[PDB]
Each structure stands twice: as C-alpha cells, then as structure tokens.
Amino acid sequence: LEHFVSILLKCFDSPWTTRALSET
Amino acid sequence: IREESSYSDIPDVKNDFAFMLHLIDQYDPLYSKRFAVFLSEVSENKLRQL
Amino acid sequence: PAYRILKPWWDVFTDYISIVMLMIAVFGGTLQVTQDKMICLPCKWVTKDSCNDSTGPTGIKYDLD
Amino acid sequence: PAYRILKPWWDVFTDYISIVMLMIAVFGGTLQVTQDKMICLPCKWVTKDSCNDSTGPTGIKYDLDRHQYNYVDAVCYENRLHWFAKYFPYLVLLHTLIFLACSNFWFKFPRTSSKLEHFVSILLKCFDSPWTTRALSETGVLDKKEGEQAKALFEKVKKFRTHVEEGDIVYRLYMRQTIIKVIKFALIICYTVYYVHNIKFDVDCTVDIESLTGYRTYRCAHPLATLFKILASFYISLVIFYGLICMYTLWWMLRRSLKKYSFESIREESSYSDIPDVKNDFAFMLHLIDQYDPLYSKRFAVFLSEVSENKLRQLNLNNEWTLDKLRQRLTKNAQDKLELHLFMLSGIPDTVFDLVELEVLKLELIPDVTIPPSIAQLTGLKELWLYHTAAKIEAPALAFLRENLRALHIKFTDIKEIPLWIYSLKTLEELHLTGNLSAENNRYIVIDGLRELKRLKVLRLKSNLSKLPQVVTDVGVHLQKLSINNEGTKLIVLNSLKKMVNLTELELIRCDLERIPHSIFSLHNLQEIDLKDNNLKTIEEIISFQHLHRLTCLKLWYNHIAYIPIQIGNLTNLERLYLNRNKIEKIPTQLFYCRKLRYLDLSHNNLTFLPADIGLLQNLQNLAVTANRIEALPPELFQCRKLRALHLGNNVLQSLPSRVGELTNLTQIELRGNRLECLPVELGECPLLKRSGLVVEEDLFSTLPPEVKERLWRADKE
Amino acid sequence: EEGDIVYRLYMRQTIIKVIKFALIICYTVYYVHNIKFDVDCTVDIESLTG
C-alpha cells in the first residue's frame, strides 16, 4: 500500500502529465 | 478514459491492482485518470520522440 | 497523513461510530465502578415466594444491623 | 491545514459557542454522577394526598432505619420525579455533538473534501505567484522558468474551471446542513422552554408501599434543582444566540443567489472586461473567500482574463527567440536584400528589431499587431509586407517609418486589415494591394486618400476592378509604372488614362480587352507592354507603335494571334520579342530589320522551317524555338555570331549540323527528346561549353570523344 | 488607507472591559460582607421535626 500510494502521488505530481493531458 | 483521450493500447487490469484503482476511484477519479497515462505504450513512444 | 486517500466514506463513518460506542462504554463502566449499589429489604408476609401486600401510622421495625 | 480562510466569522462563533455548550454539559453531567441525591421524609397527617401542616418542644420519632430512607429515596426518585430533571445534561451533550457533526461533515466527507483541498491548493499557489503582483501593478526581460510556471498555471486553472463547473454538490450539502441546524434549533427551544418550569426543589410523592414502611405519602427535597434551573436558563440563552446567527447565515445565503458570481466590480475598476461570469459550484467558493478577504478574489481573477494570457504569450515569445538563433534563420534574397518571413505567430518578437542589418520585414496572418518604437533601430529597412495583419502604431515609430520606407505590400480580405495611417506617409515609392478595393455603394472610398502619397512611382492593383480609378489618373503626374491584373474581369478605361504622361511601362493584364485601345498611342514614353490573356487575334495597330522609340519588349503570349503584321520591320529598336504560345503560321522577313534583337521566343507555334533571313540578326545572343516540328536548321542561322544559348529540345530533329562548331560563345543547348543515334563531334569545338551546359541525353552524350569529356571535366572545377 | 476598522474594534473592546470592571467591583464589594460563618434560619416546618 505505501509503495502503491508513493507511486500514485509521484505520478500525479509529475510534470509530463499536464502536457500529455493538454494535448488531448 | 481510453475511449475519451484516444489512448487505446492499454490492456485491462488483473486482480490485486484493479481493486486499488476501484478504491481510488471511490475517493476521486481524477487520480485514476492522471495515473492511467503512464500505462499507455503510446506515451512511451511519444516521450522517446520528444 | 497520506493514507487518507485509501479510506472510503463508509470506513470513516465506521470509525466515528466506533469512537461513540467506546465513549458510552467507558462511561457506563466508570459509572458502574463508582457506585455499585443495590438496596434490599425483607418482606414480612409471604405468599408463594412473594409479598402478600396486605392514631397515626408508625414505622416498621425489623431489628437488623 | 490552512482551512482558516474557508471558515467565515459566523462559523467561528458557532464553533466556540459549541465548545461552551459542551463545557456546561460535561459539568452538569459529572455533577449529577458524583452526587445523585434526593432527601425524603414521611408525612404523618395526610389531607388530600398532602400534608395537613397543622415545656419545650421535642423531636418527632418515625421509627425507621437508615437504610429504609435510602429505599424510599430510590423509589420516589425513580417514579415520581420528572424525567427532564434527571436527564438534562445527557441530552444537552447529545445535541452539542450532533451540532458539531453537522458542522464538520462537509470537511470530512471525502467527495467534497477533494474538491476543497484541490481548490485551496490552486488558490494559494496562485496567490504566491510573482507575475500576479506584476500584472496588478501594471494596472522587460523575464526568466524562462517562471514563464513556463505561469503558462502551466493558466492551463491548470482552465482545466480546473472545466472540472468544477458541472458538479453543484458542495452548495447542496451546505444548504442541507444549514437547514438541519435551524430546524433542530427550533425543536430544542420548543421542548426545553416547555418543560423547564417543571424543575422544582420540593416534591410530594405517594408511592403506595405500606408493607415495607407503613407510610402512604412522602415529602422530598432535591438540592440540585436550583443549579440545573440556572444552567438551563443560561443554556437556552446561548442557544438563542446561536440560532440567531444561523438564521442570519440562512437569510444571507438564500437572498444573495450565489450560483452566478457577478464579478463586475473589478472589471469595471481595473478595466479587464473580457472575463465571463462564473457558473455554479465555483462561484460559491469565491463568495466565501470574499467574505473572508476580498483581496484573494482580485489576485485570483487575473488569470481568467485572456488579455493577461496574450501579454504572457508576448513575453515568453520575446524571452524565447534568442538573437543568435534568429541570425541563422535570416535569408539574403534574390535582390541581395536581407529578409525575414514570419507567419502564424502570436505577435512580433522584440528581439527581431536588434537584427540591424534587416532590410525587408514580412508579417503574415498575425493578429492584433502593434508596431513598437524599437523599429527605429532598423536603419536599413526598405520594405514592409503586411499579409492579413492589421497594425496599430503610435507617433514615434510612425515618424521613423514616414522617413525610412520605400515600399508597402498589403494582402487583405476587407477594410479592417487596412491600416489608416498609410496615407499619412511621404517617402513611399511602391504600393501593392491585393483584395477588393470597393464596397457596396462606396466605390474606391478606401483609396480616396491616395492623393497624399505624392512620391508613388509604381502602383500595382489586383482587385477585380470594373474601371480604372479616377484617383490613379489624378496621381498620374508622377507615377511611372501602373499594372492591373484583373483576372478576366472587364476593365473600363474611358479617357482618363490619357493623363499619365510620365508612364513608361503599362500592363493591363487579364482585362478581357479584346482589342488594343487607341489611348496607348499618346503614351509616348512607353518602353514595355504586356497584354497577357486578351484573346488577341490581329495586332495591326502596332503600326502606330512606330513612334515609341524606346519600345524594346512586347509580350503577347497565350493569345490567338494568327500572323505577324509586316510593319514590325519599322520597330527597329526592339530587343525582346515574345510571340510564343500562339497560332502563328509564318515568319515575315520584315522581322529581320530588327537587327538589335537579343531574345526571340517563338516556341509552341506552328512553324515548319526557319527562313535564311535569320542570318540578319547580327546582335542575337539567345533563341528558343522549342517544341516545333523543325527537321533541320538553315546554315544562315550561324551568321548570328553572338549566340550563347540555343533551346531546340523536344523537337523532331533528325540531325544536328556540324556548323555548331562555329558557336564560340555557346554555353547552353537543348537537343533532348529527339530520336538521334549519335551526336556530331563538332560539339567539342565550343570553348566556353561545360558538361553541365551541354544539355542532352547521356547515351547520346557518350558518343563524343573521350578527350572532349576530359576537357569538360577540367572545365567544371576550374 | 480606507478601512478604519481595527481602531474602532479595539476602542469598543477597551470600553467594554472598563465598564464590566466597574460593574463587578460594584456588586462584588456590595455583597461580599454577607458571607458569614454562623447563620440563624427559621424555616417553618413543624410537622416534620417540631
């Protein structure tokens, strides 16, 4: 669980995501 | 999400990693959406190109 | 801290209900401990292991310590 | 963490009042627990189930044991004493708990908690941004990092707005919460006030146990009644105060109608009008933050405006393009002029204007442009091209351009893309307009102001014009070249063209004229004429061109001309004659009185042979007769000693004469597209020819001597 | 520059403290002497004790 949530928060906090979502 | 955002090449999830996603969905779907991007191989290909 | 995300709403309600239950538990417990009384008296006339229930009035004397 | 900002003042009062209520609740509870006494005695003489109330005095003797008093105490306490006096503090405690639950529910409920924490996180990281205080301060040069921070922040705000706009869950729950608090208030006031008077110090109780004691009635006393009475009064007072606060909150919320945030005050004050109003579930938050502190609303509002975003785009654009990168992107064009071509950007980078060598600027499909003063740095600017780009400008840059510009090109859809200031210019030498110059019932209003452009030497118009404008012929005092490409729309000339005495070159292109007008003969300075696409079949009128002594170039391609009139021999000053792509059947010999001709193009006509009189062009240098069916060349062709190029490819030549050896200055020759088997060796006799210049099929080329090919190899690299 | 709220509240606060001070001094000193060790009380219950 702690490993999972660590992955999840660092994915949400990642900078590439907002670009990847903005491209649509 | 794969129909909406047009990242079709993500398989369905198997046991013990789906359940976690259901829970996070019950809390907030947004984290599921933000997490779903990395599963796609198109993401890896595009980042390689970039 | 971070495990807030895991808990769904129903787990939260269960938690607070458990707190309330524990509260009343502790209260009843200490209340029992601090006074633990029962008050008994005898019954002079008996009918089938029960009370017959049969110049001003006067108090009754049982002659007990 | 920092949810203090969310809570309004009334919420604060509710919180602390709840703490006080809980305090008195706990106190009354522990007091009840730690002593729980009532003191009973019997009553000897009874009258109507009550006491008759009828040598020193003496004490009364009841003959009871100490424990029996406790028994009767418990009995009269259980039965006849009233329940409210027993269970007051417990009830109060319960009520306080359920108040607090209603208070903190919408924080602890996750579906809304996520939206709230996400919202406040965005708000605090927006408030802490530096560009916000700059943008508000405005009412230079910036870091690459913070620019990207701001851009990412904008898009975050946008997706967040899109995400919150639909929900409308928080408002509903807060509504339900307030309503619950109010109805519960009313209920507790009701029964509390109804039952409070029942508390009493003294109580008479008749319990009906004779066997155990032998007494009927009892009189009893309850010491704590007074204290609970005052606590209850104090309690209901606090509760009243609480409920009045809640009622005020309710009235405010239902009156104000918060689903739409009006927002008008800041946009009127700070003059940022292009912000829409807000819809449900994102307006409510702003109302709350307004109740806390109006400043955060203003600090947050800036990102909603698109003007702020456009300005930020301009700033990143000025930040990004470095000078060294632009220098390598520049181009030196065909006229040895340094040019830059840009298209489809958000504006003009300010770094452009430090490229001091620039001479031509081109702007294509860029919206809302304003020319900055730094354009005064481009001391060598000569041309500006504005393709579908309206441009504002202020006086300093305007004056610089008035004094330092030679040409202006405009491509436009309609008047809105025409800068009004162009007619206040004074040094312009060329104007080029692409688009319809007219509007309904307003013909040529767009160009009425041309009269102020007193130095224009060339005007070209491609505007689908029905007539020649009066203003053109009015400006014809100094104009030297006028060119109209009408794309087959019929042009009306009507006697105005005769004023243009200074005209030296005229092109009336694709005007469906069908006959050369006679006004042209008064234009005694004409040097060149082009009559593209006028369906010309006979050109006899050229006889009166004999008075145009500098006429050197006549361009009559793609017409239906059947023959060349004989009077061409009187045009002795001709240097260029193009009659290609026509229906010409023969060549008059009189053409060869034009002994100063250099260029003659008769390709794509119906010529079978070349007359011997071609030997008379003593000044001929280049010649194309391409794509006719000429079988062989006359010998007299080689009397033209000055030939340098002969384009004869894609004909049906069967042999190439040896006398090609005599063409000393030949560097380019077409023989391709023939059914030749070999080539004549005498092609090697041409000194200035190179392998790249001998334009022929490779298999035919191979037939030449190896020595020639070696000399061609030497010739190339030398 | 426009507000002038803090001064008003601090003013009202001080005034409330002072008037409340005066009131408590008043009734406290007026009633303090009434506390005593010994008391005589006539309650009028003959029936219960005589």
Side-chain angles (χ1 to χ4, degrees):
Chain A
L1 293 172
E2 62 86 21
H3 193 268
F4 178 78
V5 67
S6 66
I7 293 169
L8 191 148
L9 61 86
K10 68 187 290 189
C11 290
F12 181 77
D13 198 0
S14 174
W16 182 71
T17 59
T18 183
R19 186 175 178 182
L21 275 294
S22 178
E23 184 63 27
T24 304
Chain B
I1 185 165
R2 65 183 181 182
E3 184 176 0
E4 181 61 26
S5 296
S6 180
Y7 290 162
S8 177
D9 62 352
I10 299 169
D12 289 329
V13 176
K14 287 178 73 177
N15 57 6
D16 204 355
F17 187 73
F19 182 75
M20 302 295 175
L21 296 170
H22 291 286
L23 294 172
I24 301 300
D25 189 0
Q26 294 293 321
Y27 181 80
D28 190 359
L30 182 64
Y31 292 165
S32 178
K33 295 187 179 291
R34 299 288 183 87
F35 181 77
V37 65
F38 291 96
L39 280 73
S40 66
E41 185 178 0
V42 176
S43 292
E44 182 63 26
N45 298 117
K46 183 178 177 182
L47 184 62
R48 181 66 276 173
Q49 295 293 321
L50 181 60
Chain C
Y3 297 164
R4 297 175 293 174
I5 296 166
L6 274 294
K7 290 183 183 291
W9 61 273
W10 59 85
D11 193 359
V12 173
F13 292 170
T14 52
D15 187 76
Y16 288 105
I17 293 164
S18 296
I19 299 300
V20 175
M21 292 173 74
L22 183 65
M23 185 180 287
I24 59 169
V26 172
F27 182 74
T30 185
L31 184 62
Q32 183 175 3
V33 173
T34 185
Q35 70 259 16
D36 55 356
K37 289 180 180 178
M38 187 172 68
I39 296 94
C40 288
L41 297 168
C43 187
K44 290 179 74 65
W45 293 274
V46 179
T47 58
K48 294 187 285 184
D49 292 330
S50 66
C51 289
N52 192 0
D53 295 329
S54 178
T55 61
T58 59
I60 299 165
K61 293 182 182 179
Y62 295 102
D63 293 330
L64 299 172
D65 291 331
Chain D
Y3 296 164
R4 297 174 292 173
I5 293 168
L6 275 293
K7 291 183 183 293
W9 60 272
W10 60 82
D11 190 0
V12 175
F13 291 171
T14 53
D15 187 76
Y16 288 104
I17 294 165
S18 295
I19 300 298
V20 174
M21 291 173 73
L22 183 64
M23 184 179 285
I24 58 170
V26 172
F27 181 75
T30 185
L31 184 62
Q32 183 175 1
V33 173
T34 185
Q35 71 259 15
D36 56 356
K37 288 183 180 180
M38 187 170 69
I39 296 94
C40 287
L41 298 169
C43 185
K44 290 178 75 66
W45 293 274
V46 179
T47 58
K48 294 187 285 185
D49 293 329
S50 66
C51 292
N52 192 359
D53 294 330
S54 178
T55 61
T58 59
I60 299 166
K61 295 180 182 180
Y62 294 102
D63 294 330
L64 298 172
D65 294 331
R66 191 260 186 185
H67 188 71
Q68 295 177 354
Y69 292 103
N70 289 314
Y71 180 76
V72 64
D73 186 4
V75 175
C76 184
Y77 181 77
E78 181 62 25
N79 289 317
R80 279 85 174 93
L81 191 143
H82 186 267
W83 59 269
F84 180 76
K86 291 180 182 180
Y87 295 101
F88 179 75
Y90 295 99
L91 294 171
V92 174
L93 188 150
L94 181 64
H95 289 293
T96 54
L97 290 175
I98 184 162
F99 283 113
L100 292 172
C102 291
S103 296
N104 289 321
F105 182 72
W106 64 278
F107 289 104
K108 297 292 184 183
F109 186 73
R111 185 175 174 179
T112 63
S113 181
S114 66
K115 293 182 178 180
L116 293 172
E117 61 85 20
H118 194 270
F119 176 77
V120 67
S121 66
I122 293 170
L123 192 148
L124 61 86
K125 68 187 287 185
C126 290
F127 178 76
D128 199 359
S129 173
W131 184 70
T132 58
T133 184
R134 184 174 179 182
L136 273 296
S137 178
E138 185 66 27
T139 303
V141 64
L142 268 300
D143 191 359
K144 300 290 189 294
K145 290 181 181 179
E146 66 91 21
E148 293 294 329
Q149 296 292 322
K151 186 175 178 182
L153 188 57
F154 282 111
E155 65 180 2
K156 283 184 184 182
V157 170
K158 289 182 181 181
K159 64 175 72 67
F160 177 70
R161 184 177 177 181
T162 303
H163 176 77
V164 173
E165 180 179 359
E166 66 271 20
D168 195 357
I169 190 69
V170 177
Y171 179 76
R172 292 178 287 175
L173 292 171
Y174 185 77
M175 182 67 74
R176 291 180 183 178
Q177 183 181 184
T178 304
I179 296 167
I180 292 163
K181 290 182 180 180
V182 173
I183 58 94
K184 184 173 74 179
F185 169 73
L187 293 172
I188 59 172
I189 297 297
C190 182
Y191 67 83
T192 304
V193 176
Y194 180 74
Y195 289 104
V196 65
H197 69 276
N198 197 358
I199 294 166
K200 292 186 262 74
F201 178 77
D202 57 353
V203 176
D204 293 329
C205 64
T206 304
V207 297
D208 187 75
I209 54 169
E210 291 182 353
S211 294
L212 296 170
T213 62
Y215 293 96
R216 298 292 299 159
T217 62
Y218 295 97
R219 186 174 176 86
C220 303
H222 187 189
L224 297 171
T226 302
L227 191 146
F228 289 171
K229 186 180 284 185
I230 59 168
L231 289 178
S233 66
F234 183 74
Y235 179 72
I236 60 169
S237 64
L238 293 174
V239 174
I240 290 162
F241 184 71
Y242 182 80
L244 293 174
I245 294 167
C246 293
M247 182 179 74
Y248 181 79
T249 302
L250 183 66
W251 179 71
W252 180 71
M253 185 176 68
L254 275 76
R255 189 266 297 163
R256 173 70 178 177
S257 181
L258 284 75
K259 290 185 183 292
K260 181 264 289 181
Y261 187 74
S262 295
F263 187 73
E264 64 182 0
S265 179
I266 185 168
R267 66 183 179 182
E268 184 177 1
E269 183 62 25
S270 296
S271 179
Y272 291 166
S273 178
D274 63 349
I275 298 168
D277 290 329
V278 175
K279 288 178 73 176
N280 57 5
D281 201 359
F282 186 74
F284 182 76
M285 301 295 175
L286 296 173
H287 289 286
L288 294 174
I289 301 298
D290 189 0
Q291 294 294 321
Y292 180 81
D293 190 0
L295 182 63
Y296 294 163
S297 66
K298 299 187 176 290
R299 298 290 182 87
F300 182 78
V302 65
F303 292 164
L304 278 74
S305 65
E306 186 176 1
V307 176
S308 71
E309 184 174 1
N310 296 117
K311 185 176 178 182
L312 193 278
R313 290 179 183 178
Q314 296 296 316
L315 183 60
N316 283 324
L317 183 64
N318 294 319
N319 195 359
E320 185 176 1
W321 291 97
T322 61
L323 280 292
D324 293 331
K325 185 172 183 178
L326 295 168
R327 289 179 186 275
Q328 294 177 356
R329 184 62 56 82
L330 293 166
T331 303
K332 184 183 287 293
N333 64 7
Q335 295 180 356
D336 195 74
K337 291 186 178 180
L338 186 63
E339 64 179 1
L340 181 62
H341 189 195
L342 295 171
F343 65 93
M344 294 180 69
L345 295 174
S346 66
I348 296 169
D350 293 329
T351 59
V352 174
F353 294 105
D354 288 329
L355 296 169
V356 297
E357 296 295 328
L358 185 65
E359 293 179 354
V360 180
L361 182 63
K362 299 178 180 72
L363 297 172
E364 185 176 0
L365 294 170
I366 298 168
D368 296 332
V369 179
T370 302
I371 296 166
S374 64
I375 191 161
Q377 293 179 177
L378 295 173
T379 61
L381 183 63
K382 299 292 187 183
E383 303 181 355
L384 182 65
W385 295 8
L386 297 172
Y387 292 162
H388 295 290
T389 298
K392 292 182 181 180
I393 187 166
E394 292 295 330
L398 179 60
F400 180 79
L401 295 173
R402 286 178 184 181
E403 291 179 352
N404 300 115
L405 185 62
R406 293 288 184 274
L408 181 64
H409 292 71
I410 297 167
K411 186 177 186 293
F412 66 98
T413 303
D414 60 355
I415 190 63
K416 291 183 263 74
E417 291 176 350
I418 303 299
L420 294 171
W421 56 270
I422 61 173
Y423 291 102
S424 66
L425 292 172
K426 62 187 188 181
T427 57
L428 187 68
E429 292 184 353
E430 297 179 354
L431 185 61
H432 293 273
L433 298 175
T434 302
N436 190 358
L437 298 172
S438 294
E440 183 176 1
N441 292 320
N442 289 320
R443 299 292 182 184
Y444 301 159
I445 190 166
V446 179
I447 58 169
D448 289 333
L450 287 168
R451 293 179 179 86
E452 296 294 328
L453 297 173
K454 294 181 179 180
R455 295 292 183 95
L456 185 65
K457 289 185 181 179
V458 178
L459 184 63
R460 184 177 179 179
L461 299 174
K462 183 178 179 180
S463 296
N464 294 117
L465 297 174
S466 66
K467 67 178 74 65
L468 185 62
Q470 184 176 2
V471 63
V472 174
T473 59
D474 293 330
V475 172
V477 176
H478 59 285
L479 183 62
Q480 290 185 356
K481 185 176 181 179
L482 182 63
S483 178
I484 303 299
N485 187 354
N486 205 3
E487 290 182 354
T489 298
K490 183 173 173 66
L491 180 62
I492 296 168
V493 178
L494 188 59
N495 196 10
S496 67
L497 183 63
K498 293 180 183 176
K499 288 184 181 179
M500 294 178 66
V501 177
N502 195 7
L503 182 63
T504 59
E505 295 181 354
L506 183 59
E507 297 183 355
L508 293 174
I509 298 298
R510 292 176 70 187
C511 295
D512 193 359
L513 297 169
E514 293 181 353
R515 293 295 180 187
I516 296 165
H518 294 88
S519 66
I520 294 166
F521 301 157
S522 296
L523 300 169
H524 64 281
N525 290 319
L526 291 172
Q527 294 182 354
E528 299 186 355
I529 297 167
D530 192 358
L531 296 170
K532 183 187 267 79
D533 190 359
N534 290 317
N535 290 321
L536 294 172
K537 293 181 176 67
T538 60
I539 57 168
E540 290 292 331
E541 291 83 1
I542 66 171
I543 190 164
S544 294
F545 291 168
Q546 67 187 356
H547 296 88
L548 298 172
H549 297 285
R550 294 186 180 89
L551 184 61
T552 57
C553 187
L554 181 62
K555 287 179 170 194
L556 294 174
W557 52 71
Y558 286 101
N559 291 321
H560 300 288
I561 298 168
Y563 63 92
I564 295 167
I566 57 170
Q567 62 270 19
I568 188 164
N570 288 321
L571 296 171
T572 62
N573 289 320
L574 292 171
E575 305 186 354
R576 295 173 66 96
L577 184 64
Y578 288 173
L579 299 169
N580 57 6
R581 301 285 185 183
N582 293 318
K583 291 177 173 169
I584 299 165
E585 293 180 353
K586 67 182 178 66
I587 297 168
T589 186
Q590 292 84 19
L591 190 149
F592 298 108
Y593 293 104
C594 304
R595 296 182 182 179
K596 290 186 181 180
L597 294 170
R598 291 180 64 253
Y599 292 174
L600 181 65
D601 191 358
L602 300 172
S603 296
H604 296 277
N605 297 293
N606 293 314
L607 297 172
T608 59
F609 65 92
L610 293 172
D613 291 330
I614 193 161
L616 292 174
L617 300 176
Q618 299 298 111
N619 284 311
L620 186 65
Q621 290 181 354
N622 297 324
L623 180 67
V625 182
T626 300
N628 291 315
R629 63 183 183 176
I630 299 167
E631 294 292 330
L633 293 172
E636 292 82 2
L637 180 63
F638 292 103
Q639 290 186 359
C640 299
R641 293 182 183 174
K642 293 182 184 177
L643 292 167
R644 291 186 292 174
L646 293 173
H647 296 287
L648 300 171
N650 290 316
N651 292 318
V652 296
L653 294 172
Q654 293 180 354
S655 180
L656 192 279
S658 65
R659 289 188 67 191
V660 68
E662 290 182 353
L663 298 176
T664 302
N665 298 115
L666 183 64
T667 59
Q668 187 172 5
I669 187 167
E670 282 178 350
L671 298 170
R672 291 184 185 272
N674 292 317
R675 294 180 181 177
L676 293 170
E677 293 293 329
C678 66
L679 294 172
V681 296
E682 291 81 2
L683 295 171
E685 295 179 355
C686 296
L688 295 173
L689 182 63
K690 291 183 182 182
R691 190 178 182 95
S692 66
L694 180 58
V695 173
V696 67
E697 287 81 5
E698 293 293 329
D699 58 357
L700 295 171
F701 177 79
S702 66
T703 61
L704 296 169
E707 293 177 353
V708 177
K709 294 186 284 186
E710 189 276 328
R711 295 178 68 83
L712 295 172
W713 179 259
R714 181 178 181 272
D716 289 329
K717 294 183 184 294
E718 184 177 1
Chain E
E1 181 177 359
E2 66 271 19
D4 196 357
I5 192 69
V6 177
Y7 180 77
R8 292 179 288 175
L9 292 172
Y10 187 76
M11 181 67 76
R12 292 178 182 178
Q13 184 181 5
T14 304
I15 296 167
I16 293 164
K17 290 182 181 179
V18 174
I19 58 95
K20 183 174 75 178
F21 169 74
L23 294 172
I24 60 171
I25 296 298
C26 180
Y27 68 81
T28 304
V29 176
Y30 180 74
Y31 289 105
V32 64
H33 68 278
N34 198 358
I35 295 166
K36 292 188 262 74
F37 180 77
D38 56 353
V39 176
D40 292 330
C41 64
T42 304
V43 298
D44 187 76
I45 54 169
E46 295 179 354
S47 294
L48 297 171
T49 62

